[PDB]
Amino acid sequence: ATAPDSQRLKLLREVAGTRVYDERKEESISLMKETEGKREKINELLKY
Amino acid sequence: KYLLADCNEAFIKIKMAFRPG
């Protein structure tokens, strides 16, 4: 009851069942950006 | 990653050449 509001939002987020989706999406974004760098490298070397 | 790899062995195979001199 005396726990402040941030973990209240986390609690209701877990009740929604989407407590998975955050760590999934920021797990995805890092791999997304590094593959952006890889594919950009592919494009300059493709020109080569 | 595998397509990046494919591009890597592409990089090796394009650089070869034959000079009898």
Side-chain angles (χ1 to χ4, degrees):
Chain A
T2 47
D5 205 6
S6 59
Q7 58 273 24
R8 208 164 306 119
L9 273 71
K10 303 283 229 164
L11 185 143
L12 61 85
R13 186 165 312 147
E14 196 276 332
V15 175
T18 182
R19 65 141 301 290
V20 179
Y21 282 4
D22 52 356
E23 67 267 5
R24 316 281 73 79
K25 64 176 72 76
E26 62 260 9
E27 187 158 343
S28 286
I29 298 299
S30 79
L31 277 299
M32 183 278 288
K33 188 268 183 181
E34 63 88 18
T35 44
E36 293 295 328
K38 302 315 192 71
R39 77 194 82 182
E40 182 71 23
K41 286 188 290 296
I42 294 309
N43 305 296
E44 65 272 15
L45 275 297
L46 191 153
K47 300 292 109 177
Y48 199 83
Chain B
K1 314 285 195 283
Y2 264 111
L3 188 48
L4 184 63
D6 186 74
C7 298
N8 296 115
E9 70 269 13
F11 293 160
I12 295 90
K13 55 97 172 180
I14 58 154
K15 298 288 95 176
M16 295 299 102
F18 175 50
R19 272 318 307 144

